């Protein structure tokens, strides 16, 4: 199936687990000291947040035409509570997303293609739709 058919809350939670089994993703050392965005006030509860976020990275590339380190951050950014000052939007971290996308590219599930952005490899696109049916196999769509 196409990844469109299935729920997406389910998609990531099986795709994150998939990667961590296969020895995939060489992770940065900083992963236990990282706020993760400028608009947070705390570190994540999750201890495998890197695996989770790489799932959501590869999915969006399937849909849209692909874009760099800047655009990924804009997709993830949220609201910043400035305390006594009124809240405003802001963008999160960059150097995390710059490690994510290069780690994917090491596995050749993405690659720097033309028109100013990484795009997902046919090998990558194969692997997405492969586990997309595994979701329907599991529960029952």
């Amino acid at each position: 199936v196409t990844v469109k058919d299935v729920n997406q809350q389910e998609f990531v939670r099986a795709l994150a687990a998939f990667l961590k089994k296969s020895g995939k993703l060489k992770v940065p050392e900083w992963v236990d000291t990282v706020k993760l965005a400028k608009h947070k006030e705390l570190a994540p509860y999750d201890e495998n947040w890197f695996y989770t976020r790489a799932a959501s990275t590869a999915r969006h590339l399937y849909l849209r035409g692909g874009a760099g380190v800047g655009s990924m951050t804009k997709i993830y950014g949220g609201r910043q509570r400035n305390g006594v000052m009124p809240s405003h939007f802001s963008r999160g971290s960059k150097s995390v997303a710059r490690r994510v996308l290069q780690a994917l590219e090491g596995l050749k599930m993405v690659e720097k293609d033309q028109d100013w952005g990484r795009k997902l490899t046919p090998q990558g696109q194969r692997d997405l739709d492969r586990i997309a049916g595994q979701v329907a196999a599991a529960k029952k769509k």
Binding site: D32, T33, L42, A43, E47
Partner: protein
Amino acid sequence: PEKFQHILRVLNTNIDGRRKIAFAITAIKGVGRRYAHVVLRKADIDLTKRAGELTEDEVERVITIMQNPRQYKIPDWFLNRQKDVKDGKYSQVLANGLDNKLREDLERLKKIRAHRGLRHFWGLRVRGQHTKTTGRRGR
């Protein structure tokens, strides 16, 4: 289950076994919530249970991982103090030493008698703030 112990004393502040581990530790000054969720993970223990469920062997390691943070590879920028000033090093300050350190810097800025110590001694706001409509104790 797990009836073994509850409220305890650690260095300089009494910490309850009632609360979760990270949030329990924050009561000690010089340690915020952000500082504790790091130090627990360097210690490689759960933060998903109560502070009364820690053993003596475990908490003995906690204070060591806390008070030598550079040697357990917590970055320098993540400390309270970087080059204190006139002491020459990166430092991490905890409960009763924090107050002692703090009182020194007040004394220093009246020693030289900068603008700072005068504002301190007069009991007026240090930073750029209006005091015309701010305060009252008086009226």
